[PDB]
A paper describes a structure:
This neoepitope includes the arginine-to-histidine mutation at position 175 (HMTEVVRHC). The TCRs are restricted by the common [name] class I allele [name]*02:01.
To understand how the conservative arginine-to-histidine mutation in p53R175H, which replaces one positively charged amino acid by another, renders this peptide immunogenic, we determined the structures of the wild-type [name]–[name]-A2 and mutant p53R175H–[name]-A2 complexes to 2.37 and 2.38 Å resolution, respectively. In both [name]–[name]-A2 and p53R175H–[name]-A2, the peptide is bound in conventional orientation with the side chains of P2 Met and P9 Cys accommodated in pockets B and F, respectively, in the peptide-binding groove. Detailed comparison of the mutant p53R175H–[name]-A2 and wild-type [name]–[name]-A2 structures revealed that their conformations differ only at the P8 mutation site, where one positively charged residue (histidine) replaces another (arginine). Although replacement of histidine by arginine is conservative with respect to charge, these two amino acids differ markedly with respect to size and shape, which enables TCRs to distinguish between them. In the unbound p53R175H–[name]-A2 structure, the P8 His imidazole ring has one face against the side chain of Val76H of the [name]-A2 α1 helix, leaving its other face and most of its edge available for TCR binding. There are two adjacent water molecules under peptide residues P6–P8 in the wild-type [name]–[name]-A2 and unbound mutant p53R175H–[name]-A2 structures. By contrast, these TCRs bound mutant p53R175H–[name]-A2 with dissociation constants (KDs) of 1.1 μM for 12-6, 39.9 μM for 38-10, and 16.2 μM for 1a2.
Author numbering:
A (entry chain P): 1 to 9
B (entry chain A): 1 to 274
C (entry chain B): 1 to 98
Amino acid sequence: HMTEVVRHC
Amino acid sequence: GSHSMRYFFTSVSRPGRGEPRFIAVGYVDDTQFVRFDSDAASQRMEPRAPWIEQEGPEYWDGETRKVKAHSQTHRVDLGTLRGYYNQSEAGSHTVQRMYGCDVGSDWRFLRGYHQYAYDGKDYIALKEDLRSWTAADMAAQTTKHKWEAAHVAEQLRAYLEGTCVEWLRRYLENGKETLQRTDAPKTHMTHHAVSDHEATLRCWALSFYPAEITLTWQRDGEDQTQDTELVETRPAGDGTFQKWAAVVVPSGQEQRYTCHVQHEGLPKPLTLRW
Amino acid sequence: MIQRTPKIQVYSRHPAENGKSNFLNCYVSGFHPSDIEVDLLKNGERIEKVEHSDLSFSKDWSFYLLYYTEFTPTEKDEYACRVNHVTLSQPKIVKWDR
């Protein structure tokens, strides 16, 4: 189960 | 013992060749259970272990949704990083992310991690307290400032402490027969004459799981490290692992030497002689 | 940009016995970047049906892949693995040894 966090770096 | 879940993400830019390549894999301990390949035909998260097939269609529709969001973000990062480092648009560059949780023997939260690489070295990472960032670079500090402003750490922590371990436990239950097994190494030694003076002893460990294992040489009960050789632990292709260690001895002196094998599956460590 | 040249191991899934079905493996690891070229060879010629693992990597950040194919060993057939990578001057060939 992957995380929902995918913020641009 | 203790257990882990880990996700590995790779994005490789290819200039002139259209979109970047993106690969994603998921593991429990040493067993891979999911995949995604931007160049495969499915365009979905695919199962890689029998037991993950117990998951429903909302699982697959969620995982695919999220994996595509990871790719999309990593597609924007390749361009952001090229800027941060003032690089050309002509080279190929690589972004890697890894995250997941360790639980101990009681299946409770031990450790959580979330770390980023650019071109083969650290870029940014979440510290062990899961509430602050370690920038590897002056360049990473920009990234760190953006994530501090959007409270990313707090949402990552909730995942690592909560959702990560909850799903880890659930896989362990569901794939008990695979994931909680122990297959002890099958052990033997071999002998090959190099000269008239010297012989190579090689101590073998085959078909074991999990992948962790120690092989050590002793001479006359003392730890022997000189003139020895130890290969990296290597996948057999059927979910088990292999490894061997070798020592070069003087002719007639074979009997002084012992191989010692420690493995979750050997309560008592094995001693092999020639 | 940090580059590392891959290690190569050539070996079989099970103990080789001539006339029994098996798998021939070439494990490449510890490389970066990820792009690599791996080919299994029978007496010097390229095997056609060759699968490989899904790209993953180590705490190193360095990558690893398993290339593998079905085969039945003989007394006369020699096998090898052919690898090529930006860190190499020329492609490396590693012969299989029982």
